[PDB]
Design an enzyme around this catalytic site. Sequence first.
Site, PDB file in Angstrom:
ATOM      1  N   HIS A  39      -6.650   6.183  -0.462  1.00 54.93           N
ATOM      2  CA  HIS A  39      -6.841   5.255  -1.579  1.00 54.93           C
ATOM      3  C   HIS A  39      -6.972   3.793  -1.130  1.00 54.93           C
ATOM      4  CE1 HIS A  39      -2.734   3.658  -1.962  1.00 54.93           C
ATOM      5  NE2 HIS A  39      -2.250   4.900  -1.834  1.00 54.93           N
ATOM      6  N   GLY A  64       2.661  -2.378  -1.577  1.00 55.82           N
ATOM      7  CA  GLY A  64       2.385  -2.641  -0.164  1.00 55.82           C
ATOM      8  C   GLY A  64       3.030  -1.648   0.795  1.00 55.82           C
ATOM      9  N   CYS A 117       2.650   1.642   0.691  1.00 56.29           N
ATOM     10  CA  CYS A 117       1.785   2.815   0.896  1.00 56.29           C
ATOM     11  C   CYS A 117       1.404   2.945   2.375  1.00 56.29           C
ATOM     12  CB  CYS A 117       0.548   2.760   0.000  1.00 56.29           C
ATOM     13  SG  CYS A 117       0.917   2.739  -1.779  1.00 56.29           S
TER      14      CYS A 117
HETATM   15  C1  LIG Z   1       3.323   1.816 -10.394  1.00 54.70           C
HETATM   16  N1  LIG Z   1       2.054   1.291  -9.920  1.00 54.70           N
HETATM   17  C2  LIG Z   1       0.915   1.480 -10.574  1.00 54.70           C
HETATM   18  O1  LIG Z   1       0.870   1.921 -11.721  1.00 54.70           O
HETATM   19  C3  LIG Z   1      -0.352   1.232  -9.774  1.00 54.70           C
HETATM   20  N2  LIG Z   1      -0.534   2.241  -8.737  1.00 54.70           N
HETATM   21  C4  LIG Z   1      -1.466   3.310  -9.122  1.00 54.70           C
HETATM   22  C5  LIG Z   1      -1.580   4.375  -8.058  1.00 54.70           C
HETATM   23  C6  LIG Z   1      -2.003   5.659  -8.401  1.00 54.70           C
HETATM   24  C7  LIG Z   1      -2.162   6.636  -7.437  1.00 54.70           C
HETATM   25  C8  LIG Z   1      -1.935   6.314  -6.117  1.00 54.70           C
HETATM   26 CL1  LIG Z   1      -2.156   7.529  -4.894  1.00 54.70          CL
HETATM   27  C9  LIG Z   1      -1.516   5.056  -5.742  1.00 54.70           C
HETATM   28  C10 LIG Z   1      -1.288   4.087  -6.715  1.00 54.70           C
HETATM   29  C11 LIG Z   1      -0.592   2.787  -6.349  1.00 54.70           C
HETATM   30  C12 LIG Z   1       0.908   3.064  -6.190  1.00 54.70           C
HETATM   31  O2  LIG Z   1       1.524   3.786  -6.970  1.00 54.70           O
HETATM   32  N3  LIG Z   1       1.512   2.362  -5.192  1.00 54.70           N
HETATM   33  C13 LIG Z   1       2.900   2.165  -4.953  1.00 54.70           C
HETATM   34  C14 LIG Z   1       3.727   2.994  -4.188  1.00 54.70           C
HETATM   35  N4  LIG Z   1       5.063   2.893  -4.103  1.00 54.70           N
HETATM   36  C15 LIG Z   1       5.653   1.939  -4.814  1.00 54.70           C
HETATM   37  C16 LIG Z   1       4.956   1.022  -5.638  1.00 54.70           C
HETATM   38  C17 LIG Z   1       5.598   0.034  -6.429  1.00 54.70           C
HETATM   39  C18 LIG Z   1       4.862  -0.813  -7.215  1.00 54.70           C
HETATM   40  C19 LIG Z   1       3.468  -0.731  -7.246  1.00 54.70           C
HETATM   41  N5  LIG Z   1       2.586  -1.562  -8.009  1.00 54.70           N
HETATM   42  S1  LIG Z   1       2.893  -2.763  -9.066  1.00 54.70           S
HETATM   43  C20 LIG Z   1       1.903  -4.122  -8.572  1.00 54.70           C
HETATM   44  O3  LIG Z   1       4.271  -3.131  -8.942  1.00 54.70           O
HETATM   45  O4  LIG Z   1       2.414  -2.290 -10.329  1.00 54.70           O
HETATM   46  C21 LIG Z   1       2.825   0.215  -6.489  1.00 54.70           C
HETATM   47  C22 LIG Z   1       3.536   1.122  -5.690  1.00 54.70           C
HETATM   48  C23 LIG Z   1      -0.865   1.717  -7.411  1.00 54.70           C
END
Ligand SMILES: CNC(=O)CN1Cc2ccc(Cl)cc2[C@H](C(=O)Nc2cncc3ccc(NS(C)(=O)=O)cc23)C1
Lengths: 296, 305
Positions: free
Chosen positions: B41, B143, B145
């Site tokens: 991704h 960040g 990931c």
């Molecule tokens: C909860 N975040 C979201 O709704 C956006 N996501 C959508 C998504 C969907 C599928 C896949 Cl494979 C990856 C991802 C991304 C994702 O889950 N990465 C993250 C991983 N671990 C902790 C994370 C904490 C926070 C964060 N993003 S934030 C600025 O705080 O919204 C991302 C985080 C991005």
Amino acid sequence: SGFRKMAFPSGKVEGCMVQVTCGTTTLNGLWLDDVVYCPRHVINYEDLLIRKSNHNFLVQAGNVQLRVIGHSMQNCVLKLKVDTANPKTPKYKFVRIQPGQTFSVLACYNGSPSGVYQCAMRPNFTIKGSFLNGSCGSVGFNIDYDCVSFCYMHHMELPTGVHAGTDLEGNFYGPFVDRQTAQAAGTDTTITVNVLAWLYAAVINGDRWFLNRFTTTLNDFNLVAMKYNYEPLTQDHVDILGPLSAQTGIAVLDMCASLKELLQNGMNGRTILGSALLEDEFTPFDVVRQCSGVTF
Amino acid sequence: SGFRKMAFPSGKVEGCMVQVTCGTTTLNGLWLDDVVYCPRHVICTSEDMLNPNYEDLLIRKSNHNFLVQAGNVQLRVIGHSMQNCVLKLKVDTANPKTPKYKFVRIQPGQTFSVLACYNGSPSGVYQCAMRPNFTIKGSFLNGSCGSVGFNIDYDCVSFCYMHHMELPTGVHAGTDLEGNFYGPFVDRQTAQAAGTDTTITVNVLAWLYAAVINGDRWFLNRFTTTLNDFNLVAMKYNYEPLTQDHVDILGPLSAQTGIAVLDMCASLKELLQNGMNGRTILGSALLEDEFTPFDVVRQCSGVTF
Ligand SMILES: CNC(=O)CN1Cc2ccc(Cl)cc2[C@H](C(=O)Nc2cncc3ccc(NS(C)(=O)=O)cc23)C1
Ligand SMILES: [Cl-]
């Protein structure tokens, strides 16, 4: 999201761990530049030391044998001058921590690291670690940017299963001595400023059931906290909790009133950050670091 | 003495962490030999996450579109391929700090250490378990990931997890190092949720044996149980079924303490019924399930107190 007891990456410390053997005793040493630091009990210490020569000390770094060319004592720490400087010496400082401050421990056996965990210096100067025979010389540290701050060297286990050690200059934390005698951990207390920091961590992660409309004076909070074996909360502690109070919008004395109610009424079948106990081994800085993304 | 949630020393993994950037997205990669492994991704924008066609996004990319940074040095990408949900970037330099390693796929109930990273720089290390619902209760921010899970046995690092995403309840989902997700998750922003989680029964039993080894027996009783009756009671508290394999695996802990597995099962039944009554076990007021029978044997003394 998520809240875990997190240790600093141990790589910079792993490259410093060596095995020290003197006669029949084998423990761990810390190899920094051309010196190996280890507990002096590896050997009346001045009388025991005078009878030793350099070749009596066997220092092993991996499969390589280091040659000892000098030795001296500094408080309860033995400093073995070796003929080779450690090429993996990180940028470092020796620091003495205060009760309530946390650090990472790299538990070692035969100079080989086995595991890493986080812990706090208790108000009674002991640590609740996980150490077996052979762990003596294992070290505690923090990392700030690229600099390792060594703060603890393991020396012994007390009758209750808790641990005592020294700073890297050989000065014990607490009223302990490095010898076989009647020694006991004093009555411990809960690190109040740390419990408050962890309550703020729960509000950041979405746990607010424990909050209320009430406030408290600092003096009234301390009268209640003294009854539940909690450390007194000082104005310095209130100031230190400032960034956590600002990020969540909950005043320190309002969070104190929430803790006052949890001390009297308990949790009532509920948990906070997956715990049924009030957690005190996360400093206000550990909460900020874990809820920000600080790297090394 | 003492019992702590212990992670493996992270040094061998720290030497493999790199930063991967594709356009506006930046995440972590694992540099082993001349390959950098990272979540596929990295080639997506936020809009693409609704319904990503990774093959279509990838075909539009060249090697120089991928920026790989190891410390201050820039690695040059010379090839790229997709394997399930991981992207494999062939780089021009082999990692001189490559440890002896294996890629292993773990089963629910198995534990591992996680090295949480941001911008290819390690920030912290913690221990966790693969939950029965295939999620992990980690501590990850945006960040993270590409952060990896691993075990270290002897001098061999066994990579078992790569972080990909956070679910609505704050739990985390990821893949093995071949890009196959653990659980029914997709690397797509879809209405997917963690299934109902359960307690890892074999791990709670292992941790009760650890408490006996460290000198605590207050929770024991004079009763025994059949395996089937234990499971009828355990399912009522959302505990995983205990199998004959689990009973066999608990054998060395049963021998070291002298307490039969089905006798420890009877204590667990009673602990579930009564709670702890103001008491703790290994400094915990909850029944702990993130220590395997193998973790207890590795950490605890070979001599019971
Ligand atoms: C909860 N975040 C979201 O709704 C956006 N996501 C959508 C998504 C969907 C599928 C896949 Cl494979 C990856 C991802 C991304 C994702 O889950 N990465 C993250 C991983 N671990 C902790 C994370 C904490 C926070 C964060 N993003 S934030 C600025 O705080 O919204 C991302 C985080 C991005
Ligand atoms: Cl497994």
